[PDB]
Design a protein around this ligand. Structure first.
Ligand SMILES: CC(=S)N[C@H]1[C@H](O[C@@H]2[C@H](O)[C@H]3N[C@@H](C)S[C@H]3O[C@@H]2CO)O[C@H](CO)[C@@H](O)[C@@H]1O
Ligand SMILES: CC(=O)N[C@@H]1[C@@H](O)[C@H](O)[C@@H](CO)O[C@H]1O
Ligand SMILES: CC(=O)N[C@@H]1[C@@H](O)[C@H](O)[C@@H](CO)O[C@H]1O
Ligand SMILES: CC(=O)N[C@@H]1[C@@H](O)[C@H](O)[C@@H](CO)O[C@H]1O
Ligand SMILES: [Cl-]
Length: 528
C-alpha cells in the first residue's frame, strides 16, 4: 500500500457568505460567494506517495488527481459539515488518512444546531395552527429591552416579522429617521458606498455581529439576530420568518417609487437580500402610509401612491415567483396596512389582494398621547360605551376591507402588546376620564406615552382596571397622578379571538413580541 497520508492543519471553517465583523456599511459587511473552495494538503509517511489520490467527503469520492501534488481543491455549493479524508491508491492497495471535520456555512443554518426556546415568564404551549399567529420582533430589542431571539416564544408563533429592513437614502429620502437622534446617521454609515433605493440593514451589529446565545463562538460565521433566526428555524420548523421592509420611520423611500423603477433598485435588491439571507421566507411591505399620513407630513399623493402600491406588490410577487421556481420554495408577500377608514379608502385592496397572501390590519394606535383633547381607546374592537360610533375601531376597519371585496381569510387583526396613556387628566365629569383633557404623556417604559404590557401587570395595583365589554377594550386609571392608559388585556384579546373566529378572519398579529409576559400570546392561541 502507499504511504499513510497526513492532512496538514489549516482552518476548515468555510462560509458561503463571509461576514466582516468590523465593518459598518452593508456593502463591506457581507461577501456573498458563488461557491466555496475546500482546500486540503497532506504529506506522506511510511512509504511512497501512491499512483492516484482521492478525497472523500463521507467515504464517497469528491476529487481525484495526481498524488505528487499533495494538494486538492474541492468545489462545495451547499452548507453542511462532513469528514474529509485523503485516500492514496495504487496497484498494491489504498491508504486512508485520519479524518478531519470541515464546516461550510450559509444563511440556511445547515452548519448550526437548533436553538430551542426555553419557556420564560407565563408562556405555555401550544399554538393556534388553523389560524395565523404572527408577531413583530424589533431589531433594536437586544439593547435596553434585552430581548434576543432566544427569548421569542416561537413555538406559539406561525410568523416572525423582523422589523425593520431599511431602504438606503440620504436627505429627502429618509428624513423621517431624523426624528430619532442617531438613527438617520446610522443608516447613512450602513449605506456607505451603497447608493439610494437599495435594501440594507439599519444596524449590522445587532443583526449579524452581536454575540448572542448559541452563536457566541469567536469564529462564528453568523451571530446577532440573523444568526439566531437560522438556528431557531431548525428548532421551530413550522416557523416562517418574514423581513419587514419599512415601518413608521423607514417608509419615506416608498413614496418615491413612482419614478422610472428605483423600484427595481429596490426589487432587485430585495431579490438578492432573500438569496443572500435564505432564512427569510418572503417579503413584508410596511408602507406607512400610501397617500401620506406617514412620519414625514411633507410626502403624500392620493392616486399616485394608490397605483404605486399596486405596482410595487405586482412586481414583488412576480419576483418572488422567480425565486419559487429557482429555489423550489414558497415565498410569501405580505403587507401591514392602517386601520383608518380615511386611509383604507386610498388603496383598493381588491386588486392588491391578488398579490398579497395576507394583510396585517394594524388595529391599534387609534388614540394616543399626541393629542390631549382626543382621549379614547388606543385599540378596540367596537365603539366605546361613551361614544357608540367611533369609526377608529377594529370592526369598522374590517368591514371597510370587506366592502372592497377583501377576503376575510386574508385579514389579520392587530393586537397591541403595549398601552398609550395620558397623565394629569383634568376637567372631566362623572367617572368617565375620556371626556376630559389630559396634561402630557404618561410615564412610559422605554418611551413616555407608551407602556409595555408587562410593566402594566407589575404596576397593576397602582391603577384601577376597567374592561369595556361593549367595545371589547380595556384601560386603567390612577387618580393620584391622573394616569389613564389604554391597552390590550387578556379580556380584550380574547374578544378579538372570536371576532376573528367566525367572521372567518385569518388570525392575529401583535406588536411587539418583547413587551408581552406570556398572557397576551396565550390568549391569541386559545382553543375554544
Ligand atoms: C412606542 C413604539 S414601539 N414606537 C416605535 C414605532 O412604531 C411601531 C411600528 O413602526 C409601526 N409599524 C407596524 C409594524 S406597527 C406600527 O406601530 C408601532 C408603535 O406604534 O416604530 C419606530 C420605528 O419605525 C420605532 O422607532 C418606535 O419606537
Ligand atoms: C477559525 C477556526 O476555528 N479555525 C480552526 C478550525 O477550522 C478547526 O476546525 C479547529 C480545530 O481543528 O481549529 C481552529 O483554529
Ligand atoms: C431556509 C431554512 O432555514 N429552511 C429552508 C426551508 O424553509 C425550505 O422549506 C426548504 C426547501 O428547500 O429549504 C430549507 O433550507
Ligand atoms: C412620536 C410618536 O410617538 N409618534 C407615533 C409613533 O410612535 C407611532 O408608531 C405612530 C402610529 O401610527 O403614531 C405616531 O404618532
Ligand atoms: Cl473560499
Amino acid at each position: 500500500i502507499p504511504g499513510t497520508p497526513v492532512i496538514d492543519w489549516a482552518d476548515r471553517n468555510y462560509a458561503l457568505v463571509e461576514i466582516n465583523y468590523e465593518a459598518t456599511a452593508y456593502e463591506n459587511l457581507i461577501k456573498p460567494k458563488e461557491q466555496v473552495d475546500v482546500q486540503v494538503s497532506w504529506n506522506v509517511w511510511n512509504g511512497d506517495i501512491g499512483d492516484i489520490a482521492y478525497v472523500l467527503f463521507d467515504e464517497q469520492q469528491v476529487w481525484k488527481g495526481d498524488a505528487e501534488s499533495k494538494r486538492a481543491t474541492i468545489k462545495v455549493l451547499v452548507s453542511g459539515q462532513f469528514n474529509m479524508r485523503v485516500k492514496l491508491c495504487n496497484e498494491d492497495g489504498c491508504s486512508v488518512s485520519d479524518p478531519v471535520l470541515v464546516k461550510v456555512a450559509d444563511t440556511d443554518g445547515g452548519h448550526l444546531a437548533p436553538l430551542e426556546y426555553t419557556w420564560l415568564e407565563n408562556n405555555k404551549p401550544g399554538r393556534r395552527e388553523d389560524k395565523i399567529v404572527a408577531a413583530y420582533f424589533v431589531e433594536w430589542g437586544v439593547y435596553g429591552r434585552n430581548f434576543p431571539v432566544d427569548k421569542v416564544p416561537l413555538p406559539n408563533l406561525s410568523h416572525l416579522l423582523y422589523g425593520f429592513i431599511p431602504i438606503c437614502g440620504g436627505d429627502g429620502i429618509n428624513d423621517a429617521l431624523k426624528t430619532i437622534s442617531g438613527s438617520f446617521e446610522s443608516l447613512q454609515r450602513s449605506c456607505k458606498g451603497r447608493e439610494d433605493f437599495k435594501v440594507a440593514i439599519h444596524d449590522p451589529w445587532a443583526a449579524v455581529q452581536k454575540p448572542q446565545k448559541s452563536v457566541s463562538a469567536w469564529n462564528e460565521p453568523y451571530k446577532g439576530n440573523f444568526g439566531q433566526l437560522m438556528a431557531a428555524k431548525l428548532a421551530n420548523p413550522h416557523l416562517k420568518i418574514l423581513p419587514s421592509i419599512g415601518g413608521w420611520t423607514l417608509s419615506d423611500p416608498f413614496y418615491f417609487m413612482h419614478d422610472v423603477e428605483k423600484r427595481n433598485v429596490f426589487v432587485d435588491s430585495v431579490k438578492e437580500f432573500l438569496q443572500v439571507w435564505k432564512f427569510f421566507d418572503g417579503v413584508d411591505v410596511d408602507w406607512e402610509f400610501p397617500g401620506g399620513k406617514g412620519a414625514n407630513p411633507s410626502l403624500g399623493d392620493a392616486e399616485r401612491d394608490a397605483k404605486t402600491y399596486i405596482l410595487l406588490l405586482e412586481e414583488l410577487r412576480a419576483m418572488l415567483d422567480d425565486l419559487e421556481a429557482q429555489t423550489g420554495r414558497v415565498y410569501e408577500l405580505t403587507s401591514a396596512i392602517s386601520a383608518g377608514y380615511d386611509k383604507i379608502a386610498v388603496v383598493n385592496y381588491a386588486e392588491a389582494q391578488k398579490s398579497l397572501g395576507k394583510i396585517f390590519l394594524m388595529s391599534y394606535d387609534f388614540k394616543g398621547a399626541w393629542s390631549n383633547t382626543d382621549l379614547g381607546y388606543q385599540t378596540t374592537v367596537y365603539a366605546p360605551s361613551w361614544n357608540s360610533e367611533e369609526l377608529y375601531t377594529t370592526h369598522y376597519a374590517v368591514d371597510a376591507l370587506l366592502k372592497q371585496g377583501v377576503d376575510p381569510n386574508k385579514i389579520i387583526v392587530g393586537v397591541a402588546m403595549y398601552g398609550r396613556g395620558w397623565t394629569g387628566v383634568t376637567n372631566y365629569t362623572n367617572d368617565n376620564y375620556f371626556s376630559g383633557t389630559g396634561n402630557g404623556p404618561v410615564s412610559g417604559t422605554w418611551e413616555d406615552g407608551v407602556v409595555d404590557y408587562r410593566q402594566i401587570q407589575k404596576d397593576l395595583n397602582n391603577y384601577v382596571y376597567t374592561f369595556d365589554s361593549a367595545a371589547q377594550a380595556s384601560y386603567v386609571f390612577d387618580k393620584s397622578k391622573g394616569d389613564l392608559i389604554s391597552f390590550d388585556s387578556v379580556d380584550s384579546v380574547l374578544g378579538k379571538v372570536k371576532y376573528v373566529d367566525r367572521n372567518k378572519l385569518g388570525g392575529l398579529f401583535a406588536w411587539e413580541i418583547d413587551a408581552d409576559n406570556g398572557d397576551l400570546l396565550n390568549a391569541i392561541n386559545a382553543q375554544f
